Amino acid sequence: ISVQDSNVQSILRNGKPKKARISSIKFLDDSQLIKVYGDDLPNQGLQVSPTQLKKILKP
Amino acid sequence: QPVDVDNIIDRLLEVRGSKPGQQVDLEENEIRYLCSKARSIFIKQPILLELEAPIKICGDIHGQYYDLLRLFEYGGFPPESNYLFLGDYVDRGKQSLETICLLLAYKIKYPENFFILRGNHECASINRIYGFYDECKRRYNIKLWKTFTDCFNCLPIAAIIDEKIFCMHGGLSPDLNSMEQIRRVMRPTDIPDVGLLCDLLWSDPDKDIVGWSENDRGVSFTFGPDVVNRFLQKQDMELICRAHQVVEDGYEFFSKRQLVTLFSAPNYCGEFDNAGAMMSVDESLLCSFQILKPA
Ligand SMILES: [Mn+2]
Ligand SMILES: [Mn+2]
Please indicate, yes or no, if residue B34 is contained in any of the structural domains.
Answer: yes
Nearest CA in chain B to A15: B50
The resolution of the experimental structure, rounded to one decimal in Å, is 1.9
B53 reaches A (C-beta below 8 A): yes
The alpha carbon torsion through B115, B120, B122, B124 (nearest 10 deg) reads 160
Experimental method: X-ray
d(CA B110, CA B79): 7
A50 CA to centre of own chain: 15
**Rg over CA atoms, chain B:** 18
Residue ranges of alpha helices (H) inside B76-213 are 96-109, 124-127, 132-139, 142-152, 180-183, 196-202
B52, A13 Cβ separation under 8 angstroms = yes
A7 reaches B (C-beta below 8 A): no
Please indicate, yes or no, if residue B91 is contained in any of the structural domains.
Answer: yes
Cross-strand pairs, B167: B159, B241
Please indicate, yes or no, if residue B193 is contained in any of the structural domains.
Answer: yes
**Beta strand B239-242 with B259-262: parallel, antiparallel or unpaired?**
parallel
Task: Give me the amino acid identity at B261.
Answer: T
Supply the residues of B annotated as catalytic.
121
Q: Is B120 annotated as a binding residue?
A: yes
What spacing in Å lies between the alpha carbon of A20 and ligand 1's midpoint?
Answer: 37
B244, B88 Cβ separation under 8 angstroms = yes
Residue B85's domain spans which residues? 26-292
Please report, for residues A8, B11, B16, B28, B268, the alpha-carbon distance to residue B22 in angstroms, rounded to integers and kept in the order given.
31, 12, 10, 18, 19
Please indicate, yes or no, if residue B3 is contained in any of the structural domains.
Answer: no
Q: Which of B49, B252, B275 is nearest to B165 (CA)?
A: B49
B292, B276 Cβ separation under 8 angstroms = yes
d(CA B57, CA B92): 21
For residue B188, whether the previous peptide bond is cis, meaning omega lies within 30 degrees of 0, is yes
- 3-class secondary structure, B173: coil
Cross-strand pairs, B292: A37, B276
d(CA B152, CA B146): 10
d(CA A45, CA B258): 27
Q: How many CA atoms lie within 13 A of B197 on its CB side?
A: 23
Looking at the structure of chain B, the number of domains it has is 1
> Do the Cβ atoms of B288 and A58 come within 8 Å?
no
Please indicate, yes or no, if residue B229 is contained in any of the structural domains.
Answer: yes
Q: Assign residue B104 the CATH number of its domain.
A: 3.60.21.10
Please report, for residues B182, B215, B227, the alpha-carbon distance to residue B223 in angstroms, rounded to integers and kept in the order given.
19, 9, 6
d(CA B157, CA B169): 8
Please indicate, yes or no, if residue B19 is contained in any of the structural domains.
Answer: no
A46 reaches B (C-beta below 8 A): no
Please indicate, yes or no, if residue B9 is contained in any of the structural domains.
Answer: no
A37 reaches B (C-beta below 8 A): yes
B96, B63 Cβ separation under 8 angstroms = yes
Task: Give me the amino acid identity at B213.
Answer: S
B183, B208 Cβ separation under 8 angstroms = no
Q: Which of A40, A53, A8 is nearest to B76 (CA)?
A: A8
> Do the Cβ atoms of B293 and A39 come within 8 Å?
yes
What spacing in Å lies between the alpha carbon of B202 and ligand 1's midpoint?
Answer: 10
Cα angle vertex B112, ends B122, B247, to 5°?
A: 45
Nearest-CA distance B295 → chain A (Å): 6
Please indicate, yes or no, if residue B2 is contained in any of the structural domains.
Answer: no
Long-range contact set of residues B140-146: C-beta below 8 Å, sequence gap at least 24: B140/B28, B140/B31, B141/B28, B144/B28, B144/B31, B144/B32
d(CA B187, CA B122): 14
Minimum-distance CB partner of A14 among B46, B165, B288: B46
